[PDB]
Symmetry: D2
Subunit: 216 residues, 4 copies
Amino acid sequence: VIKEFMRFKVRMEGTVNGHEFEIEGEGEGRPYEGHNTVKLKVTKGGPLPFAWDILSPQFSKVYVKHPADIPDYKKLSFPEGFKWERVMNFEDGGVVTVTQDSSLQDGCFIYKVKFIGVNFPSDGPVMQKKTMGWEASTERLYPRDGVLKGEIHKALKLKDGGHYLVEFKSIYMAKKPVQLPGYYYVDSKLDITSHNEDYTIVEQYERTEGRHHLFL
Amino acid sequence: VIKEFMRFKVRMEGTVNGHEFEIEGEGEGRPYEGHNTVKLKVTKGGPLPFAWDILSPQFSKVYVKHPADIPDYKKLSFPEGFKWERVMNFEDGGVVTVTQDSSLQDGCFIYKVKFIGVNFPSDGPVMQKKTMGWEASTERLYPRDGVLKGEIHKALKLKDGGHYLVEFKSIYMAKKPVQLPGYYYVDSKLDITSHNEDYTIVEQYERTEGRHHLFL
Amino acid sequence: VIKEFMRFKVRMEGTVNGHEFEIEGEGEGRPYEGHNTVKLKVTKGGPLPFAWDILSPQFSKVYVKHPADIPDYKKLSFPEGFKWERVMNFEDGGVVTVTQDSSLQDGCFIYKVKFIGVNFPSDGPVMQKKTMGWEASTERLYPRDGVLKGEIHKALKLKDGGHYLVEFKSIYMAKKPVQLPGYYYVDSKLDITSHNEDYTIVEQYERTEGRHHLFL
Amino acid sequence: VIKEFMRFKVRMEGTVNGHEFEIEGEGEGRPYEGHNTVKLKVTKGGPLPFAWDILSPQFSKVYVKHPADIPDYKKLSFPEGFKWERVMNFEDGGVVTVTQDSSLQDGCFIYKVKFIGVNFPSDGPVMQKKTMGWEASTERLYPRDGVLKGEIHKALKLKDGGHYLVEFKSIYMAKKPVQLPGYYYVDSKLDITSHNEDYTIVEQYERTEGRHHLFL
């Protein structure tokens, strides 16, 4: 079902401060190694009048490398798949909710994303495109309400120095109740590997792996 | 442009905890008197697996009665119109973002809404449909970032007694720059006037008027 | 117990961004008319390195005028009195928690307050003293867990224009379970009537009255 | 100044939901190895009417083991020392702010803590004492405003199962500006190693170490 190498296609429909847009992409990676890349294209509403960085994390948790003793809830959910939703609370008031469906079709993962971002200050980092990528991050996960949940304290690097803080709250829901893991963590590092002048064509790379707390 | 009697058409595309649905409706009211009603039909995704109440407020401020000394930002925005976005933070973790466009076509207001609700507990008031309508409310508004903003501490009455709290944060954005008001308030009371057994056909009534603080 | 005219004494022990201070005051008013004034003096920690405005609201609801049909929980709590606590969430990260005890000693109300404020940006309106008093406000109250709770969307006027937003969450706890009101509101307007340059000596006036929603 | 072995004494003055209490203790540890213990005694307000767990993390970061390439801001602040403040946002509404001062005297660290906790549901995990200790955690830190800040997504284990979520927001302020680290993490695991029936006497052990993200 989930091969050593897997490709995926994604489509996002979103709005940010009243500006609607569409994005289509194709990616690939090694689900058991914790690596995956993706190439995106703004197919509608481009060039985007905000930082591409807020969208990069919405474009693969099935590719998270999991140790044998931590049930890989997301991988187990296939072939049916899972859905995930998320809240992004930015420190200057901006708020985003995301809903996504992940399925398996013709040997390829299919991602469907709906994005709504609101309340971003007009002179803030997002609308002024002053961000420079995310710092590597660490997610705290745990089972609840029959599904998997996780929170992350993330940060975008600012062009003029400093950080722009964003709290991530995600909900991973398998389409069939498969084995859930316990309290654990997932380290991720997402890099923008290429981009044209106006970010209408972008490529990303993500390394992500789950683990127990260094149990210090 | 804004007659004493105006009708409107509305369509909402939304998702709540991974459940997709569509709703279309028709309303009418008296913009200078602060009254307006609307009849809705769940055109897709019905019956809804959640409380209808969280949707009722996404279904009119151009109909808010305003004193002569308080600029009616929304009315002034027409014929072009305005967009409004919103964040609803529920006390039990549920979060929703909404983005809407309000326009005027041949004497009839046109509303287009996109709604995304996430993180609602499966045993909570919303997913268990234990709500019984909203209490009348009072929104605190003010100008900022060249637009109009307002927050509200609202509450849903619970069938088993008590209230279910929700904080509202809205942004009203005219499509063309117009006169903004100062720090003021808007009282509203929304009632569900009719509904079939599964809430696939619902009618609503809302009275809403703006005013200065009772200037105590 | 509660006469048409009542005086009170207050003492606050507080800390803000690592700065310790103490304040003592004396006030008076007409509990049944909704008016009361208070005079403060910074006895330790002066001059304060932050805006006085964040402290003014911690210095009386027993003086809130209530309609005969709305139980005046706070007045009913005496002679024993009541305790109140509160959270103030500032839009720029600043957070404050307050705990207070109100008693009646020799026909005089006695207020004991503890205050801890943290996370205020050193460049923010608070630490830079860029505020000019609060806008009149409106609190939303309701009963819960045997006590009375209330929330407010308040705002401080900024010297250079605009507002600085702060959300209030209060908990009023009678020392003995006395009668509680239903869902209602309380309007208030606090004004600094006098003060020296460094706010080591200040006088305040507050008008506050309870009521049902104007019911729109 | 900071030897391989160091003792400390601490005193806490706090209040929770109107209940006041005072705690005194003494601990010891190995600053460069990341190990430290502490023994507490509720000297006033005991037996506490709430879960001891919310207080345990308020009782040593100068004992965090740091790699040579990461400036140990907190150790460098001595002999004068540093102050730290914090906000703990509990998922059911509870909110706590803490302010603390850390100094070095006659070769012994001296800790003074003030604590105010409010808005805990009378039937919640805290007031019902339904918690069973913290899960090991991971704090995300970064420099800002000349000081060191960090956030943590923590969880308290529940007796009836599941977790009780709490977000930590801390600010570490050296009394003199000493070198700051960059974006990094601190792992910690605090265990209650001893306690009498009513938690009026308690002992704790904490292992905490700083490090760069596993830099995936």
